[PDB]
Design a protein around this ligand. Structure first.
Ligand SMILES: *[C@@H]1O[C@H](CO)[C@@H](O[C@@H]2O[C@H](CO)[C@@H](O)[C@H](O)[C@H]2NC(C)=O)[C@H](O)[C@H]1NC(C)=O
Ligand SMILES: *[C@@H]1O[C@H](CO)[C@@H](O)[C@H](O)[C@H]1NC(C)=O
Ligand SMILES: [Cu+2]
Ligand SMILES: [Cu+2]
Ligand SMILES: [Cu+2]
Ligand SMILES: [Cu+2]
Length: 576
């Protein structure tokens, strides 16, 4: 057995926002190298844990893994953690229509801050759009505190928050608020990340100085820009100086949307947008005084301490990379919660039909509640009056199901009378082909120290993508939303990550409903699928749910193509 691709994960001192950070890196860099997959293929990726005293898993964000649930890479859900000095063979099955932008990252603790890289399913000459080339734009947060310090604070009976982001990286380069970019030498600066111009372009070069991230383009071309929200905390809003025509053509990987023209991108943790950019002609550059550099300006939204950073859209490798401008290049809207809502529709509406209101047979509301956990004294994020951590159980759910079958499954009847989760197992069961509406209901915090506060959360589903059927302030009202969808003739798109926003001042009475997001999905993919806030600190604090779709007969008949070490913690898991 030889795997098709290999990723080696280690701890290394790397450049992070013009500082040094002891990061969990892939193949020596943060972000890690781009992996390119074919649609309609089986591809094996061996992940080595070369760390001394930390566990690892690798999650393939946005890939449903419908035929390889044991390859989802989710500790407590689909596998034992990969131990130090061992590996795990991941079977990636791409369906023919999976062409799109995804990303891989650790699903252990806060490793995903740094242990993250692009995962591209190639069109193979099948994109319904022309473009001369592509660029990957992968965004990360920089924290000055270590992963261990942040986890200890989050899990302490004297709660210490991580603090706000200390920098935004684009393809491994950016600037902490304590540092300042200076002019970079002309020539290559990883400005071609994701380019097909030639593999060299599949892995960033770490910066050697404090210099701005660069996207290198030629005049008068069209680029497919693959925006990847690999931030562990930040919701970003961003735009390009004097470039106002961005066309979004794909959302969260698979889904071709009818083209939407925007002047800025908003990008939360776990989201991807494929955007066509038409670059200025040599004549238009001549008329801006032979200007060859334009600022990309990116800002955090919806958090207490604003942050602004820059990258450079560069038209000529002969131009030195400029420092950040003394005053802002452009103005990004203060508001985020009404950007392209009830907007994206399928390009081919025929082959992407959202479940109708009539077809929904059950609704599960996940009320997001911050409060002290009485049993532990920890500050936690509850969903539907429960909490879930990657230490909620010893034996991972899917391992238990493959070992015992029916006896490991959650109790459906008990879950229906307890907010959708089984009192005995804290799992959310769904029948195969059950048509669900899932609502995330935001609320004012019960925590003294944040009383009545509402936060914005990027909500992500593992496995099958859902249809986004809307959002709004206050309490979800299904009768009103159904009336809204019908009045608009709205044709929803499939997504795997949507924001649950704060509205207005973001402060209500403790426990008062204060913003919602609604999903619909016909649950077609048996297995064990996490649904969670994609902010790493909120996951540490328990903002996760585990969904078990189907009966044991629907899961155990999916062939387990890995060795017997899958069943126990301590050994390498190899493919077959
Ligand atoms: C790696 O993960 C394993 C498996 O979850 C961890 O070991 C478990 O550790 C908990 C907490 O100490 C114990 O209650 C269990 O006895 C352990 N389970 C098994 C199967 O051994 C281990 O702590 C993790 N290692 C690191 C570095 O976090
Ligand atoms: C990562 O590095 C290993 C050797 O350390 C190599 O064998 C593997 O091919 C590299 N993977 C990628 C995608 O570059
Ligand atoms: Cu993810
Ligand atoms: Cu995911
Ligand atoms: Cu959250
Ligand atoms: Cu996840």
């Amino acid at each position: 057995f030889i795997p098709d691709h290999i990723l080696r994960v280690s701890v290394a001192q790397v450049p992070s926002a013009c500082e040094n950070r002891e990061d969990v890196v892939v193949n020596g860099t943060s972000p890690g190298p781009a992996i390119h997959l074919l649609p309609g293929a089986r591809t094996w990726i061996r992940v080595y844990n070369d760390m001394n005293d930390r566990n690892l898993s690798m999650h393939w964000h946005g890939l449903s893994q419908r035929f390889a649930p044991f390859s989802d890479g989710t500790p407590s859900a689909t596998q034992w953690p990969i131990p130090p000095g061992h590996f795990f063979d991941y079977e990636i099955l791409t369906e023919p229509e999976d062409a799109g932008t995804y990303f891989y990252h650790s699903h252990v603790g806060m490793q995903a801050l740094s242990c993250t890289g692009p995962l591209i399913v190639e069109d193979c000459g099948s994109s319904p759009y022309h473009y001369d080339d592509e660029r990957i734009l992968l965004f990360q947060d920089h924290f000055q505190k270590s992963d261990l310090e942040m986890i200890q604070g989050l899990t302490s009976t004297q709660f210490t928050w991580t603090g706000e982001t200390r920098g935004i990286l684009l393809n491994g380069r950016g600037v902490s608020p304590n540092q300042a970019a200076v002019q970079g030498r002309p020539g290559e600066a990883s400005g071609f990340f994701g380019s097909h111009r030639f593999r060299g372009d599949d892995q960033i070069e770490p910066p050697t100085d404090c210099t701005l991230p660069v996207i290198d383009v030629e005049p008068g071309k069209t680029y497919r820009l693959r925006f990847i929200g690999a931030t562990g905390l930040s919701l970003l809003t961003m735009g390009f100086e004097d470039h106002n025509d961005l066309t979004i053509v794909q959302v969260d990987g698979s889904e071709y949307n009818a083209p939407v023209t925007v002047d800025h991108i908003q990008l939360g943790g776990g989201q991807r947008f494929d955007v066509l950019l038409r670059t200025k002609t040599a004549e238009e550059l001549r008329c801006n005084g032979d200007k060859t550099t334009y600022f990309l300006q990116f800002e955090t939204r919806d958090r207490p301490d604003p942050y602004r950073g820059y990258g450079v859209l560069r038209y000529n490798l002969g131009t030195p990379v400029p420092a950040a401008p003394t005053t802002p290049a452009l103005t990004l809207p203060a508001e985020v919660n009404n950007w392209l809502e009830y907007t994206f529709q399928p390009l081919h509406p025929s082959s992407s039909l959202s479940p109708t209101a009539e077809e929904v047979t059950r609704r599960v509301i996940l009320e997001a509640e911050q409060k002290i956990d009485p049993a532990t004294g920890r500050l936690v994020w509850k969903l539907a009056h429960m909490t879930w951590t990657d230490m909620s159980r010893d034996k991972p759910v899917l391992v238990d199901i493959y070992e015992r079958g029916e006896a490991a499954m959650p109790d459906y009847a008990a879950a229906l009378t307890n907010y959708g989760w089984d009192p005995a197992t804290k799992l959310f069961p769904a029948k195969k082909d059950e048509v669900l509406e899932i609502v995330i209901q935001n609320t004012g915090s019960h925590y003294s120290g944040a009383s009545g506060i509402v936060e914005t959360h990027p909500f992500h589903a593992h496995g099958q993508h859902f249809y986004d059927v809307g959002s709004g302030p206050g309490k979800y009202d299904p009768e009103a939303n159904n009336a809204k969808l019908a009045s608009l003739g709205y044709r929803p798109i499939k997504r795997d990550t949507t924001m649950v926003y704060r509205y207005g001042e973001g402060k209500v009475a403790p426990g008062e409903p204060a913003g919602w997001r609604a999903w619909r999905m016909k649950m077609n993919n048996p297995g064990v699928w996490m649904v969670h806030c994609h902010i790493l600190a909120h996951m540490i604090m328990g903002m996760e749910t585990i969904w078990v779709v189907g009966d044991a007969e629907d899961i155990v008949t999916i062939p387990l193509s890995v060795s017997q070490n899958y069943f126990t913690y301590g050994g390498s898991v190899y493919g077959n």
